[PDB]
Each structure stands twice: as structure tokens, then as C-alpha cells.
Amino acid sequence: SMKLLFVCLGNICRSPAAEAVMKKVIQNHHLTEKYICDSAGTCSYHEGQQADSRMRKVGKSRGYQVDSISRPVVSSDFKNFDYIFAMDNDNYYELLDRCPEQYKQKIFKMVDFCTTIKTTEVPDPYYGGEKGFHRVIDILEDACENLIIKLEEGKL
């Protein structure tokens, strides 16, 4: 029914983890029948690629199944998804640049649902160490938990 799209740049680190974390939060709240999650990237360079092995490893250690095949955002995503969540500001403006005016209200910064971690973005962990991957999960656990609450309260 309600369809949620999580968007980063490559759809190999951040947004696959966002999808996995959000799926878990939804399952925890017994709302699996009501929500569908997906992820995509603003860029198609990595299209067809498995999630980054480090994110899969860190994901698993944190209790998540990170399992995605990278895909680019397509124009129909703006129509077909109910809400779209950008991992960082770059993703956010890219999405808005491509989004028809009538669907722009669907697009949010992931971090605008953080209530604990003070951060301006879900930082790209690709060129750092394992700590950067954990940081992404930290931010997602904060934001995704508050997001499910806002969705169920109808606050969007």
C-alpha cells in the first residue's frame, strides 16, 4: 500500500542500508502488510551491483540483512512512491531537480527524521573504514524509528 523509496548516490552503501533498517522497523511495528520499501541511486554507474560488502558485513553485525542490487532512480519513481528519502543534501537537490512540481512534496531528507543524532546528512561511508558504516546505521536507526511513527500518525 504505502511505498517508501530511499535514495543515495550509488545505491550500494547508504540507501540499501536504509531499506534494510526501515524494513526491520516496519516488521518490529507489525506493519509489513502496509509498507513496501525500495532503494535507488541518483547515479546509474553502479547499476546491477550487489551492496558494498562492508555494508553487508556491518549490516549483519548490527542485525540487518543488507541485500540490494543497485538501480537508478527513474522518472516513474516520483509518481509511484508515496515518499522518497534522500541520504544527503546532494541526493535531495538532485531528486528535486528531476521531480515534477506536483510530486515534490513527497521528497524528504532522511535526517529530518532524526531525533537523537545531530547530523546534516547520512554521510557517504564508501572511502572510510568500518566506523563510517556503523555511523550510517546509527543515523538510520534514529531516523527510521521516528519516520514510522510520523507515517502512522499521518504527520506527512
Q: How far apart are CA 15 and CA 7, in angstroms?
A: 5
Q: Of these residues, 8, 13, 114, 144, which one is catalytic? A: 8
Axis crossing angle, helix 14-28 with helix 130-152, rounded to the nearest 10: 50
Binding mask 122-151 for Na ion (x = CB under 5 A): ------------------------------
Interface residue with Na ion, options 23, 46, 71, 106 (CB under 5 A): 71
Asked if 69 interacts with Na ion (CB under 5 A), we say yes
71 or 106: CB nearest Na ion: 71
**Enclosing H/E stretch for 141:** helix 130-152
Residue 6, judged by CB atoms within 10 A of its CB (0-12, 13-18, 19+), counts as: buried
Q: Of these residues, 52, 77, 124, 142, which one is catalytic? A: 124
Q: Measured at CB, which residue is nearest to Na ion?
A: 71
Least Å distance between CB 95 and Na ion?
17
The grid coordinates of residue 139 equal 543515523
Q: How far is CA 69 from CA 9, 17, 105, 120, 142, in A?
A: 13, 12, 27, 27, 25
Nearest to 8 by CA among 118, 114, 96, 95: 95
From 43-51, 66-74, 102-110, 119-127, span contacting Na ion (CB under 5 A): 66-74
Q: Which 4-43 residues touch Na ion, going by CB under 5 A?
A: none
From 56-64, 65-73, 111-119, 137-145, span contacting Na ion (CB under 5 A): 65-73
Q: Which residues are catalytic?
A: 8, 14, 124
- Interface contacts to Na ion, rule CB under 5 A: 69, 71
